Design a protein around this nucleic acid. Sequence first.
DNA 1: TAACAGCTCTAACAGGAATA
RNA 2: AUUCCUGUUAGAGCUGUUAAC
Lengths: 56, 456, 456
Amino acid sequence: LTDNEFYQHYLQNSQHMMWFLGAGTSRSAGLPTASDIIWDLKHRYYCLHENQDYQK
Amino acid sequence: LSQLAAHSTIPEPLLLFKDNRTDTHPLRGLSQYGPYSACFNLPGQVRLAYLAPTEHMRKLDAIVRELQNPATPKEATNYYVEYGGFEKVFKVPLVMPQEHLRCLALDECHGVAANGNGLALADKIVQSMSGLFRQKHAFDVLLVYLPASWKKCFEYDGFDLHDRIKAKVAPLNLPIQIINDTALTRQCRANVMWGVSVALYAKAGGIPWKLADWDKDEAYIGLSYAIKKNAEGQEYTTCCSQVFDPDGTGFEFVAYDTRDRKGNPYLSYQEMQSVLSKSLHLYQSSHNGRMPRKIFIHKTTHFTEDEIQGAFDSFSSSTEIELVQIIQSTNWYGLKVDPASYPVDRGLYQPLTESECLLWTQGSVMGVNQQNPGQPVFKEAALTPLPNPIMLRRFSGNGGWHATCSSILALTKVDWNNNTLYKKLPVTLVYSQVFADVVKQTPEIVNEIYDYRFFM
Amino acid sequence: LSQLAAHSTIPEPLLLFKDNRTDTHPLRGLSQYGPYSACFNLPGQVRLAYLAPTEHMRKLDAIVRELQNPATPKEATNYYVEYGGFEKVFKVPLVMPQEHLRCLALDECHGVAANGNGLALADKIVQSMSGLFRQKHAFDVLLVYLPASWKKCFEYDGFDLHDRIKAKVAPLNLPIQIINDTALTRQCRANVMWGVSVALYAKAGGIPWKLADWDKDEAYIGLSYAIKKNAEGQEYTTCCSQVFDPDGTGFEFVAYDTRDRKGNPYLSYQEMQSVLSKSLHLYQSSHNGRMPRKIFIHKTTHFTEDEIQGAFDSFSSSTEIELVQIIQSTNWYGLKVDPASYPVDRGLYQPLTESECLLWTQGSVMGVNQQNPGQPVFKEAALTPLPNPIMLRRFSGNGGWHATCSSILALTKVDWNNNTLYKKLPVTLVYSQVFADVVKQTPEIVNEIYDYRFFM
DNA sequence: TAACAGCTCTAACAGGAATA
RNA sequence: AUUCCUGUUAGAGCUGUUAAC
Ligand SMILES: [Mg+2]
Ligand SMILES: [Mg+2]
């Protein structure tokens, strides 16, 4: 289904439309994604045991 | 009580190639992707000249000619990949030298071969190559050939022929790749061809490979020494080396003397702070003037109390100094059990005590072997049956075995002069040793710092 | 109805120099005090290198000697100041290269130039640099000379040799000061000497002068584009430059790409948001994470709705954004009356419409006249008899024409590559345009960001 | 999508030097 | 390309306003 036909279909019947937004919209909201969270956790974990400066 | 601290196996470091296509195995990556500097086209075409006695001239042509043809390995086939020639593998044409560039060793050298005078032979060879001083732009790499008949002056007490020749030629700024009968003799042709091809490409100015995802803000210093057997006492020649990565894409590798007389290999406060300040200025010059956020120092012997303070007083607070001593001779040795059919994995480091760890720089590596795919490869299976773990003694690092262990493991893979998978020591240590030999042979080098491409 | 809003002349911005002294005349201050960055030792000494054909190297050493010795201004003596000698004025020795720090271009470059192939000529010039690359630590700045015989490849359609060379040597970290025959045959000598010397100091170290009265909490952004004429259509390559004064003393001036294909010079929502994200992330890295409070995005063309929405949504509410558009060619032009002999004082801004203002980046400047002190000076007197103002069409702001106008005026004076007193456009726009030309010539540069000293 | 109007920009050249 | 931007010759890019398709 081409995007334009989808837009026309949605506009035709927009009064009955659930939305489903999981972890994909948050990427563009200025908040870290799943991969960013994973990398942050890895950063804390590595800096903690192997004593390394966090902000360096 | 038979329980030791949990060992951690550092993964095999990756090497950077053309179009930043990473690979652990250097020669295979060179075949598949090409040299790292191929994208920059820094060497362009490679133009090389000869300097040998005419009675062996043809030999040089032959090997150079055979540099331009494919070769299939017969020895160490478990590791070496099929050679494709300089034109194909390095994406660079190999230029046949013209008669104007080609030189002949002056006749009196042969005569002094009978006299057994190494200094005279080296000076005569330099004067033979003096015909190439004016035509420095025409050629990039010189191929000096020393016949087996000169073996009497090859090595003797207090003198090293290749060392003296390179020490004489380096201030003139023209690389040589000395070729002896060994390179011709050697059965497996692909081994020697990989060696000479990589050596020539790197001596021209290109970079065959670089450490993948290497930090540009860390400089890895390495200090070594050499013995000169003086008539009255001993002489210790200490020289340093740096393998940092500048803000550009290429990476640097420069050694220099630490200097008037030393009877012990331990740098004092003044000398150590001076060499470290020179190293700091060298690093600053490349990175526009930015401080190195972390400094690694690999010394073959332990750091003195004054020497540690000398290392500290040379840098600011932001710099992190991890003084490390590398020990090659240890009573420990490891056996891998799951009893593994292949020796203990390379990079497996075992923390023995606070500020003392065992690193297995030597060992089996996964996925590198070509024949029988999916099996470990032991590079030194010919010499030793089992690997010998080196030992790190920490002196200054605040914390973390991973930083030093991974840094050293990755550093043992960027020796272009080496045509095998890795080394026993980081390139800093081996190049500091080589330059220590060079300086010990020739005292009039202490003033200037030199790149790795000259003495490699 | 003929009485417009009262204007106010922003005074000449002060420039931070040696020992934090301020002087609105750049060259006079440099002679009197010295470079701002000379307070610290970022450049230890300006070591140079030469790359030219064997025939024209004498021009390079002659011009270097001319830089060594003082010179007097012959043309435009109204503004220029007598050269005091590089060592005296920049307080740093200028080192002439030795034999090995002085390379020779391949003779194949002449053949390529006769063939009229710009790409291969640039490649050959870059490949000639290997002799210096073996000694990259030795020198700081390389003076590449191009003989007039290569004019056929200097500039033609779909190509520019200067941009290709700059983009080829930018990832190799070596600054390059290209010298044409024009710099040799320019009538005056102090002109060329001042320009070349300030460029050499900026490329070896940095910051010949820094703008004073600069809030550390403002990051200034300038977008500019260029056109690559495709056979089928066109490609609009737009790039963004950024200036800011960080917490450290080193004022920062960078540029970067914006990524695929663009048919128009107006960024979409996603591209504008991505570029702005990269910008404030760079600022945060240079400000230990502190959020910028004022953002100025100067664009040569009007911001669409998408660009303004991307600006609004990329930052938080605490950081007010000053979206301003700069119009170069305008119908308006003014004449000062008390009628004055010299045109209107530089920096006068005249609010025409609630969103559109005239800014006089060109005009008479007070207090920088060498002869007959007190007389005004018009920088573009030779080119134009009257100053053509620019139009600032604010697309987003809270209040205050003075805030943006003074920032633009101060940003028009920190172009170290500019020999003259000021620039018609802010350094953000000019550097974004220069980098746009570079990227248009070499599309494979979008990966990295670069400091000003590489491309100025 | 095809013209037409304006506003503004860059892309190639050429080009002379700070109130005389 | 030490610089500066003054013009010339062109084309695009946006806006529009119509006619459509
Ligand atoms: Mg060798
Ligand atoms: Mg320049």
